[PDB]
Amino acid sequence: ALPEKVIKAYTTVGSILKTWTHGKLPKLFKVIPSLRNWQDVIYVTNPEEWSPHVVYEATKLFVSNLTAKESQKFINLILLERFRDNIETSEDHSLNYHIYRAVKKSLYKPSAFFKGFLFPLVETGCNVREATIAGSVLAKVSVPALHSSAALSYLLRLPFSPPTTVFIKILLDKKYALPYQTVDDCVYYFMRFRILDDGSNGEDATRVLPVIWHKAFLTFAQRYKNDITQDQRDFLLETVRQRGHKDIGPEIRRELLAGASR
Template sequence: MGKASKTQDKQRHDPLYRDLTTQGGNLRTKARGAKKQEKNEDEEYIDSAASRKILQLAKEQQEELEREEREALKENSKFNFGRAYEQEEESDDEFDQEDEENYDDISDFGGSDEEFQFDEDDLNEEDARLFEQYLQQTQPAKEFGTDGQSYNLADKIMASIREKEQQFEQTNESKVEKPVDAVLLPPKVIAAYTQVGQILSTWTHGKLPKLFKVIPSLNNWEDVLYVTNPDKWTPHVVYEATKLFVSNLSSKQAEKFVEGVLLERFRANIEDNEDHSLNYHIYRALKKSLYKPGAFFKGFLFPLVSTHCSVREATIAGSVLAKISVPTLHSSVALNYLLEMEFSPATTVFIRVLLEKKYALPYQIIDNLVYYFMRFRVVKEDAMDEDSSKAKAAPLPVVWHKAFLAFAQRYKNDITEDQRDFLLETVRQRGHKDIGPEIRRELLAGNARLPPKEKDADVDM
């Protein structure tokens, strides 16, 4: 069979618009303006007599309206507008019919909205004052604000509403006392970061919320951080937050974070655990905080030893300090701060850790170390100070003897001959049965440090 042709010579049926037009459909086949043009052609014009009658009726109605307005004006004002104005009114009442026919349009007679026109020169001062007073009474009064601009009734209502709201807020503020630790943040911010805190209370892995990551870049980051409730963070969040804040904040600001968050979580975690151990993630957070040594010492170590610090807490924190390298300057300052504090086993733990790092300490710090260990030797009763009496009353802990041994092993060549003798006397009086002989052997094996004068003499030779 052959293929059907694509085009046909004849249509199978008539187009749809033909059916609509032939069967009484509503299809429009002519332009919209054609019908109007036909109507305009059929309209007839009004002759001159009919138009004159229409104008006469309009004029009579206009005069009647003007007469009523003048009567109302006289009753309300109760004053005379002047002789010139009365003459003008009388002239308006005596229109001639011949003059009326000369007008071709009704607008020439004036509408009801026309204003009275008169010559101001014919009015005296009293009439002008009364006229202005009348206009102020008849025209609607305008309301003006404090800035000189007019405002309508709606503005007036809104102003009164705002005034009532301010009075209500002032009364509530006087009745409700704000808490001391209140956070001055917008309600939306508080609501958002409260939800973030709920997420962080169960967070263990994955990505941290973006709202939490931007906190270090905020000026009031402490207030926003407080809203997230760091006490309920998981240990995983403590580690991630320490990395985030220590790396993005300055040393002073990181110190506030370490003291306010990390130190509190460190102590709470050791106290809450049955075996008094530290969570692995918080232990890692302590390591990360040491990347800013100033923030670690001022925000963690010094507040820890200033309060009641147990030997367990000092041992765990000291193990972190022993594993991370700390600059010599920071170690020297921290060691000097610990030497000036009251004696306690926890303080001696950190002294020993810093001594075992074997830094090249300045002679001033070494002299302070010598005086620190010399304080515990026994002297005569009349010359005994408070520290020596305390040392004599109670035996020294083993950690003190270990710290003394670490000092003798590392800095035995950096002390003078007199200092060596004082330290040997301390070992003899307060030495440990096992550690004391080791300290004595180390001190005797060292070479004494030459005084400054003898060093200068050797150089001159």
């Protein structure tokens, strides 16, 4: 249990931060990042009942003043929550602009974002709305090639869904320098959708694949055609043969054939 001084002072500051719209944030709210236990103190302020302004500004403050794990805990326990809450409880099911700019302020630390925002989002009922919106977030923000490659390699190992393919498509449209292992995870992902005739198939083998999977396959085959071996290229041209698109299939095949192995 906490001191009653902390209780009353941060319930008072928690009544302040409900209506705060401009000027300077409270003095007791800017000394919380410097605390060894900022998370027992940040709860008394009542995180879900801040105004969108305080969401944006506390995102700035705590993602710019805490460490990577602390920025991750913050973006996971408060920002992701408020994000999903404002998308779910609103009536056109839209997101406020301050919560948004806050997500854009949580993607300045891509490790904290991906591990704390994107990954616990996609694995807890990520519908098409939250991923149209978070997909817009990631599509707008510049992220380091290493954290982008690692987030890509995480989204590739994820169960197939149209939002996750939106995300993989978006990180492949970045066209950065991926390590050969990330490109490996890409080829394995786009491989797992072919039909093995020898008696070993899942659901990804015969399922209906959207426009986004063929676009992501097209961008992958466009940027990383020189960074795949001959074997992986044959597996991918095989996936083109079986699971190819009417217009995109031939161009993915052409983008795999016009490449030099490593």
